[PDB]
Symmetry: C3
Subunit: 239 residues, 3 copies
């Protein structure tokens, strides 16, 4: 029984788009007398950044019980409804947004949303709540964020540089040499000390495994991102 | 359903303080004291401080999509308070200063009630919850209300991207003249288009999702580039 | 019966931590079919600033009806559950965070939390209290409290107003002399007009009693904290 619907957008709160979305959903639900809880994950995803969105979805969703998750972030086409092994429904565009969250929870079926209607996502999400599921044209694959090439995965509110590299891929207190190439060609090489906490090796750059299992580059009381001029997608090379 | 179950909140309180929480708290406190079950939705709390033009535009964009319900909006540079019942039963609670202008017009005003002393941020809250409990409101009626003049063409609101939205609801290189507050006038050339992608080299104007003529600049902030703010006069020619 | 649970953090929403916390609680809640409202008080508390948090909690909570409140801000770990006279429960670090709210509501009992499980602990412990409508464990005698006898800066407004420790206990319109000692050591002396509204005396620095009953320093349409360069915990002396 589907009970929760979550929203994750890059709309911001300066506008009233998010509110509209809640209104639509809320309207449909009341018309079919379907009680459900609307939960906000985040509306501060950086405009058009599917990677940022992908990372926040990966961090929040797995902690919810089976439920519906609407995520609207697309720098513009294709849009899907994903069904997870355990029965989670992921509403949103087909551009990679759900890549990580999809793998984590397991893909059971990919159903293409058909134009029988932006505000599509909201409606589709509500529909899934009332009908407690969704049916439609099953699809072969889905657009997926290439996870083979190591790069800057996400950037913190503090400016910490979160990488692709998972704990299971990295051989403590040793000195690592991280190479970072920006999209424009400039290349930066730094020396980090793989530690356990943020309060360690305060004098230099440090890298540790964060609460999501990825190698992250940080600088005590600073903003490594701004210090290295590192942006999303920069190529990472450890050695 | 003819039962009031939803109540939204729109403010310029921000989240740095606990005023928003205190408001949700008082609402909940009252709803419990009458075992009234209702959902509380936030539309936005990032309305620019004291800017009723920003609020009015946000309310217009979100409220129409909700089913009949109560909506508390608190943005006001210090007075006269009101409850507005729309045609389809919606209830708008807030200051009588033009805040509810656009939304009230699109939902049709059934009646405007005056809020007495009978009872402040924690005042629009009690009223909104009271409406939920009694499934309605009553008071001395008001003939007309304060309204944001929509006949004088000016900057309606400013996007998070810096886009300049005018209250111009046209025909078509457009030439737009702006009269800032101080009196200085600027004149720019816009390429009237359909999407934000077209004509990247120069300024562009277009009709946005809300239906108003909007000025923008590819991946940049027109508002800052032109130094345009709320209420600047617009003149197309 | 406990039906409401509020969240107050310094997590922000650039990340999915707040979402994971909502899901976590919801998950436990849907596993005992316990229905409850998850209210958001604020997630924009300044990172590690417990003074900021303590102030927000004092402002919002007393207006709620008896319920549960999870507040997560701590630069560090001792964890507690404060039970109020009227049945409110405060859940979070024993570092002074709940100092003001605790006194206002009145303490019935402070219970230590046995690490038999930190983002998740407070979450789990909160839902748990909702499911059982109460808590139990080793009782603690006293908690850490923010020293309120030491006159200083309580909080800083979003406008930049300097909120002080001094409660509603000189006269109106008089000219108060205020000395402020920063952390660095330097002292600043300013003259203030004790008024009753932010609009009066738009020329000089003014001070007044804010909606929380505290003496506040403000400057019409300007940021008092930035102008005087005042930070949290700066010592305040009136003469």
């Amino acid at each position: 029984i589907l009970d929760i619907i979550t929203l994750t957008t890059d709309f911001g709160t300066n506008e009233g788009y998010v509110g509209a979305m809640k209104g639509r959903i809320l309207n449909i639900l009341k018309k079919y007398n379907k009680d459900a809880k609307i939960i906000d994950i985040s509306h501060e995803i950086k405009p058009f950044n599917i990677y940022h969105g992908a990372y926040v979805l990966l961090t929040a969703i797995p902690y919810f019980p089976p439920s519906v998750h609407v995520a609207v972030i697309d720098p513009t086409r294709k849009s899907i409804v994903i069904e997870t092994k355990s029965g989670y429904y992921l509403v949103g565009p087909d551009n990679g947004l759900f890549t990580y969250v999809a793998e984590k929870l397991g893909i059971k079926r990919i159903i293409k949303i058909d134009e029988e209607r932006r505000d599509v996502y909201a409606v589709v999400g509500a529909e899934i709540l009332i009908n407690n599921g969704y049916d439609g044209e099953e699809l072969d694959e889905m657009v997926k964020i290439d996870e083979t090439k190591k790069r800057v995965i996400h950037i913190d509110r503090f400016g910490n540089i979160i990488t692709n590299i998972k704990k299971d891929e990295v051989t403590y207190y040793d000195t690592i040499m991280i190479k970072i190439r920006h999209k424009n060609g400039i290349e930066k090489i730094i020396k980090c000390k793989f530690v356990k906490s943020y309060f360690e090796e305060k004098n230099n750059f440090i890298c540790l495994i964060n609460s999501e299992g990825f190698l992250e580059i940080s600088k005590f009381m600073d903003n490594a991102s701004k210090l290295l001029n590192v942006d999303y997608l920069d190529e990472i090379e450890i050695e």
